[PDB]
Each structure stands twice: as C-alpha cells, then as structure tokens.
C-alpha cells in the first residue's frame, strides 16, 4: 500500500484547475506503484484550500475543480488500479447564514432540501459565539476560527454518514483521511468509519514532540506515539483505521542532520509509531502543512531522500508527497525505492532489525532481504552481509537487497 | 576494590620527595575507601618520571625517593589496610655501558653481582642499533627510544621474576601495573604474573579508538575492547589480571560533552570493556598520560565529576586519579560516590541496566539499588522509581539510592 498525497498548499491556485492538472499525472502515479492518492477537500470552503467547509454537498464551488472533474479524476485513478482517498474535514464547518442573533450559525448542505442545513443546535455547546448553548459539548478539540460540529447529535451523525456514503457512491471515494481528528473523540470517528465502511482511513492526530533540556526532541517519544496507538485501539484495531506517524516524521527531521542514533529507540526498536504498531501507522517525510509553502515542520531539504530511503524500506505504510515526487526531481530515486520495497514484498508489517544507529550511520535490515544505510559513514561493508548487492543509492543513503 | 593512582607526571619534581609527601596523604586515602594505590616506577631511570629504567635493583636513584622511603610509604599504606601496586616497566630498559661497538647495550642490575647485568643478547633480535641480532625477536611492540628486552630469553625470565619477587618480598609491593603491555605478548606477561603471584595486576594496553566519518569516535568500539578482553583470556581469566578500560575512558571523554547516548552500546549494554567483562576491567577518568601535564587524552575538565559519577557507580574496578581527588577540590564529591558504591556493596561485577541514554541524559540502575543520572536534563523524576532517594548530586549528575 504506498500512498501519494496528490496536492500541496498551492494546488488550488493552479492555472486551469488542479483535478484537471492531476489527470495528466495518473499514469506516472500508477506506474510508481502507488496504490492510493489522497485528494484535497472537495466541497465549498471559505478558505480556498478546502479546510474550512460549508456547503458539504456543493463540490462545484471547489477551487480545485467541480464535481464533474473530480469524478473524471477518480475515474482515471480507478481505471489505473489506484484508489482515491478523501480529506474529510468534519470537525468544524462554516455557516452560510446568520440567524436571529446576527451570528453565522445556519448551515447549508448545498441542496434544495435539508440535508446538512443545521443551525446552532448542532454546534457544540460551548463554541461561542456560534453555539447557542443547546448542543452537546465538544468531544475533542476546538478549532478557533469556525463552528465545531456536535458529533453526538444524531441528526449530525446521520446526515454526515449519508454524505460520506454519497462521496463513496456518487463520487467514488474509497477511503478517508480525517482532518484534525483531535477535533472529536475516537468514538465519534468510529461511527463514521464503521458506518461508511471505507477500504482505508487515516486520521490526522498531530501533537508536539517532547523536548528536552537542550532545545531538541527527546529520543524517547513514547507519550507521543502512545496517543496515536490509542486512537487506533478505540476506533478499532480490526478496522481499516490508521494514523499518520508524526513521531517518525518528527524524529527523522532531526535525526537526519547527523543524529541518526535517534533512530534506535530506548528499546532498540524504531522510535516512531512503526516500532509499536507498524501495521496501523502511515509514514511520511512531509505534507502540505509541514512542508510545501507552509513550512510548519519541514524535512531538511538536502536530505529528503534519506527520509524516503527510510520510510520506503521500513514497516508502516509510506506516503509520498506530491512535491518530492513531481517537483524536486527525486522521481526516479523515489521510484527505485518503491520498487525495492515492492519487489521484496516489504509491507506495512515487515520485520525490522536495527543493526547500528550511530550519529553518522543508521543501518537496518528489513525482513531479512533489504538493508538500508543512511548517513555519511564510509567504512560500512564489514557490517552488510555476504549475499547482498546494492539495490539503490544516492546522497547519504544506499540500500542493498539480497541476491 | 577501588584503586587510586598515587602520582602524576609532575610528581618526581616535588620539593622534598614524592614518597615523603605521600606519607601525609595515607590516612585520607585509606579513609576514602581506597583499597590499592599505584605507585610510580621505583628504579633508576634515565627519564625522571621513571619510565625509562636502567638499574632495576637500584631504587635509591629514583627521583621520587629512595628504597628506605618507599618501604616506609608501603609500610604506612599497609598499616592502614591498603595495598600498594607497582609500575613494572619491563618492555624496555636502558643500558649502563657501551659494549665493543660503542653502543649502549650493557645493562647493570644495580648490584655487585650479575643479576640483571645483561648485554645485547638479551635485546630483541631486531632493535637496532642496540640489538646484536642474536636474541629472539620481539614478542610485541617496540619502544623506539630504548632497548627492548627479549622476554623469551630464559635468563631474562628468571632474573626478572627474581626482581619481581624481591619487590614483593623485600620492598612490599602487592601487585603490578604492567607498563606498555603491548610491548610483549600476553604469554610472556603470564609467566611474570603466574610466577610472581601478585594479588592484583592490571596491564596497560592503550590503542586508538575507531573514528568515523565525522572526526568523532564510533559508537561501536568493539574492536577496541576485544583486544583488552583477549589479553585477559590469554593471560588467564582466573588470574588476578585486569586491563585498564581505555574504551570507556575514550567514549566517556566524548559522551560527556552532550552526547550521553554514546553510553548505551549497539547491544544496549555499556560500550566499554565493562559491558563484556566488568570483572577484569579497571576504569578511570584520567591518568598521568591522558591528563596531568601531558594532556594526551584529557577528560573535559568542567565534567570530570560526571566521569566519576559514572565509573564510581558502575561495574568494573574504579581508579581515582591523584589530581582529581587531592588538587581539584573534588575530594568530597568523590568520597560521597565511593561511599554510595561501598554502602550498597556495588562491586566490579554488579549488574547494570541502562534506563535511558539520550544526548542530554544517561540514567542507569546498578544492582537494583542505585540509579545515576548524568546530563543536564531536568525533567527526570518520572523515570526514577518510587523507593529511591537521592544519595549524591552535583553538577550534571545525581545518584539516587534505594531507601
Ligand atoms: C495545520 C494543523 O495544525 C494543528 O497541528 C499543530 C499541532 O497540534 C501542534 O501541537 C504542532 O506543534 O504544530 C501544529 C501545526 O503548527 C492541527 O492539530 C492539525 O490537525 C492541522 N492540520 C489540518 C487542519 C486544518 C484546519 O481544518 C488545516 O488548515 C491543515 O491544512 C490540515 O492538514
Ligand atoms: C604514553 C603512552 O603512549 C602509548 O599510547 C599511545 C597509543 O598506543 C595510541 O594508539 C593512542 O592514540 O595514544 C597514545 C599516547 O599518545 C603507549 O602504548 C602507552 O603504553 C604509553 N604509556 C606508558 C608508557 C611509557 C613509556 O615506557 C610512558 O612514558 C607513560 O608514562 C606510560 O604510562
Ligand atoms: C506494542 C505496544 O507497546 C506498549 O508498551 C504500548 O504501551 C502499547 O500501546 C503498544 N500496543 C499496541 C500495539 C499492538 C500491536 O503490536 C496492539 O494490538 C495493542 O492493542 C496496541 O495498544
Ligand atoms: C561477553 C563477550 O562478548 C563477546 O561478543 C566478545 O566477543 C567476547 O570476547 C566477550 N567475552 C569475554 C567475556 C567473558 C565474561 O563475560 C568470558 O569468560 C570470555 O572468555 C571473554 O572472552
Ligand atoms: Ca439545503
Ligand atoms: Ca470552534
Ligand atoms: Ca471539535
Ligand atoms: Ca651488577
Ligand atoms: Ca626499542
Ligand atoms: Ca617490545
């Protein structure tokens, strides 16, 4: 399962429309061995990138393109074997109309009927000024800038599950990435996952790493991955549910700048979520927030390939980011890695054994068939077994594969 | 067994004589809980510090003092419970007289008889110009500046074992530290150890650490401690034989400057010799060469107490260096640590479990009774068990002891 993020922060701006643009990259994407692409928020949003949704059923006001273009793109991805997963922003919603108080708290689903046309009662009890105090309190965090939907209200749960099934059925989406899933409880999410039955769903739980007395992250980030592992438990370990592994991303970010010892945790296992539940963890080097033009937590640029050498050979389900693959010129090195991975049947639950993790060398062996070396360390051969030949290499990475 | 090094590079210079001087520190030394003190080379040496011996039986030409003063000092140490171990420099010897060739290759033992009065035949075949080609080749490394004794010659072995037994019997020495034990084979050393039967013997095998592609030592220094562990095997694992743990000293030197992750080796065990054979390893922060006025491999000065917090709580047999204890003002902090160690019966073979080793924190638990934290990391309490109270602390160290 290797995922691709088919957009970045600037994508809405594209001349002629991003979904149209993306039509052209479907073959390349299919060819890299990508199995799912995560498409940006489809509905009408106040914010052009999509994360501030209003008329949920109105896919036509999207700045990425209209419903007709979405279905053609999802048609193309599907015709080529790949699945399309959708950014479900349902923690918060923006309102169409002012109520009596002059507050924008009357929602409009986008259709002549009443689906999704809620008012203040479906806003979480306490999210003043939008709330009118009569809904249930928030199951999770608040998003400041907008109304937070009260996911314990039953009309909310039904109309939002109808909308999810419509996105699967009429639009074609296969799975969900749940935006700001800290916004609501794993229980609420579970209803949506269970009742829409996606073939894949990844939640975005993003919290800070623990930082030590030195301004740098701690080697141990067990509080941080526990929280990911916990969401997956409550939601259901047997489900399709996964969380992005922000722990590996946070560590790697630092590790790569000459601190590769950071990659062998306290227990001698990988320090990120993939060290405890690789199966339910999807890994990434960067996304539209951490990277792109937002630069919230970027991977060191001169090192993104050591990042892909790591996520692509290791357990967990890797996510390639649009920009790296298509705009940085790393296409081919990334391809080669996705091949090594697919060729040896490396998969989300592969076994990892960390041979060495010193400041200047990380050497790990996955599934007995592939070894990856990250780092500038030159004197290395003595540790890579007889029987392996180098499969890929580039800047401060090399991966050998057996015979 | 905690050893003390009762001298440094400048000691020969002391006004009024070092052994005399040292008479005054015997009580303090005895009181710290020190069980052995390593005294500098006793015989006549061309080089004032002792490491260039000539008339082996002539203890009177020592710049540290004469035979009478040595015996009084060893008498005092013994009267107070401590043993005295001697620096046996027998790899090389300097000659008293020129032979026919005009080469200084006629030795003089220091007595009217012939004990130790060898000539070129007892010099290793190849150490030109001193050698006359008729002796056996060197069993080990060469010391450039002087004649290397051919320890395979049987007269050499007998007279040098007589001299060793005289140092035990007439002078009072209890054990040996074998200077430059790379100078000769572990086999030759074994004869001297076995036949003089010391109660303690430590060899000085000093080689370089492996350095990586970054100018810093590798985390793994297994080639380096293998060599120590090997000498002890050939010499005899059941003997009194030990080697100084240069591996821990080399690592620690670096580790302490914010790289405390260096202290959990590749295998999750201590990286120095004490991780493989703690019993046969004697640890140190610095000695007359690495430190003192020679500064060959000094411990970072503002950090020597993190070094003693480590060696004093950990397995292996610790060696306190004269200067730290008596001249740096660390006496009391060092004492306190030697107490924690002795109080809880921590000993050369105690069990070590490394809780965490991150750049800014090293936390280890010895024998279930003591925990030591090295590093500036502040947020620590969550990892030290309920039941432990802090026993000592100071600059970037603290050690707790159970109840
Ligand atoms: C951009 C996002 O911000 C939040 O993550 C923050 C973490 O909580 C914080 O602890 C860490 O140190 O830094 C973060 C960013 O600075 C949200 O939790 C995260 O979910 C959010 N990501 C998405 C949500 C949006 C609003 O609906 C967006 O505009 C993003 O584009 C989404 O991917
Ligand atoms: C001072 C000593 O030098 C040697 O150690 C060197 C190591 O071999 C080298 O690899 C390392 O990088 O650095 C070293 C010092 O720069 C000898 O091997 C060592 O045994 C020697 N130590 C003693 C021997 C002497 C000569 O008889 C001395 O003058 C010292 O005072 C002794 O302790
Ligand atoms: C393997 C694990 O290490 C533990 O110390 C964590 O506290 C735990 O949460 C994590 N457990 C998870 C991982 C797996 C699979 O390895 C599960 O099935 C568990 O339910 C899930 O909580
Ligand atoms: C425990 C050890 O780890 C091994 O990987 C080393 O290669 C080995 O040399 C070392 N072995 C030594 C240590 C002990 C005690 O632990 C012995 O009795 C052995 O003879 C001695 O070689
Ligand atoms: Ca409507
Ligand atoms: Ca809100
Ligand atoms: Ca919320
Ligand atoms: Ca004589
Ligand atoms: Ca010589
Ligand atoms: Ca020699």
List keywords for this structure.
binds the ligand C[C@H]1O[C@@H](O)[C@H](O)[C@@H](O)[C@@H]1N[C@H]1C=C(CO)C(O)[C@H](O)[C@H]1O, 5-stranded antiparallel sheet, binds a molecule of 2 linked components (BGC-DAF), 8-stranded parallel beta barrel, Immunoglobulin-like, alpha/beta, 403 residues, 10 helices, globular, 2 domains, binds calcium ion, TIM Barrel, homodimer, 15 strands, 27% helix, A-amylase_pln (chains A, B)
Written description of the protein model:
- The structure is a homodimer of 403-residue chains.
- With 403 residues, chain A is α/β, with parallel strands linked by helices.
- The first copy, chain A, has two domains: 1-345, Alpha-Beta Barrel (TIM Barrel), CATH 3.20.20; 346-403, Golgi alpha-mannosidase II (Immunoglobulin-like).
- Helix content of chain A is 27%, strand content 17%.
- Chain A has helices spanning 18-23, 26-32, 67-79, 154-171, 186-196, 222-236, 246-255, 304-313, 322-327, 331-343, and strands at 3-5, 36-39, 83-88, 97-98, 104-106, 175-178, 200-203, 241-244, 281-284, 317-321, 352-358, 361-366, 370-374, 388-394, 397-402.
- An eight-stranded parallel barrel of chain A has the order 1-2-3-6-7-8-9-10, surrounded by four helices.
- In chain A, helix 4 crosses helix 5 (186-196), helix 5 (186-196) crosses helix 6 (222-236) and helix 8 packs parallel to helix 10.
- The radius of gyration of chain A is 22 Å and the shape is globular.
- Chain A binds chain B through residues 212-214, 216, 218-220, 258-259, 261, 266, 268, 356-361, 375-379, and chain B through 212-214, 216, 218-220, 258-259, 261, 266, 268, 356-361, 375-379.
- Bound molecules: a molecule of 2 linked components (BGC-DAF) (2 copies), the ligand C[C@H]1O[C@@H](O)[C@H](O)[C@@H](O)[C@@H]1N[C@H]1C=C(CO)C(O)[C@H](O)[C@H]1O (2 copies) and calcium ion (6 copies).
């Amino acid at each position: 399962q290797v995922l691709f993020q088919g957009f970045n922060w600037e994508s809405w701006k594209h001349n002629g429309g991003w979904y149209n643009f993306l039509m052209g990259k479907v073959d390349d994407i299919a060819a890299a061995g990508i199995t799912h692409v995560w498409l940006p928020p489809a509905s009408q949003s106040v914010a052009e990138q999509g994360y501030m949704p209003g008329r949920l059923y109105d896919l036509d006001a999207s700045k990425y393109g209209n419903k007709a273009q979405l279905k053609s793109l999802i048609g193309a991805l599907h015709g080529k074997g790949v699945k399309a997963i959708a950014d479900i922003v349902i923690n918060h919603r923006t309102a169409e109309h002012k109520d009596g108080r002059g507050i924008y708290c009357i929602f409009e689903g986008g259709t002549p009927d009443a689906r999704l046309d809620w008012g203040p009662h479906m806003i979480c009890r306490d999210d003043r000024p939008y709330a009118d105090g009569t809904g249930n309190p928030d199951t999770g965090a608040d998003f400041g800038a907008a109304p937070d939907i009260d996911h314990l209200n039953l009309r909310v749960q039904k109309e939002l599950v109808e909308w999810l099934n419509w996105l699967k059925a009429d639009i074609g989406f296969d799975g969900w990435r749940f935006d700001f899933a800290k916004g609501y409880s794993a229980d609420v999410a579970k209803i949506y996952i269970d009742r829409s039955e996606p073939s894949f769903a990844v939640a975005e739980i993003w919290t800070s790493l623990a930082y030590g007395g030195d301004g740098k992250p701690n080697l141990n980030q067990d509080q941080h991955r526990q929280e990911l592992v916990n969401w997956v438990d409550k939601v259901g370990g047997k489900g399709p549910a996964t969380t992005f592994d922000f722990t590996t991303k946070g560590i790697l970010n630092v590790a790569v700048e000459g601190e590769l010892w950071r990659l062998r945790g306290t227990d001698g296992k990988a320090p990120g979520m993939i060290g405890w539940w690789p199966a339910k963890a999807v890994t990434f080097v960067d996304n539209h927030d951490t990277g792109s033009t937002q630069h919230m937590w970027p991977f060191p640029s001169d090192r993104v390939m050591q990042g892909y050498a790591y996520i692509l050979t290791h357990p967990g389900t890797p996510c390639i980011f649009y920009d790296h693959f298509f705009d940085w010129g790393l296409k081919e090195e990334i391809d080669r890695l996705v091949s090594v991975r697919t060729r040896h049947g490396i998969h989300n639950e592969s076994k990892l054994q960390i041979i060495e993790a010193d400041a200047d060398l990380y050497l790990a062996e996955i599934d007995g068939k592939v070894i990856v070396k990250l780092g500038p360390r030159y004197d290395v051969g003595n540790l890579i077994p007889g029987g392996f030949k180098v499969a890929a290499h580039g800047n401060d990475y090399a991966v050998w594969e057996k015979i």
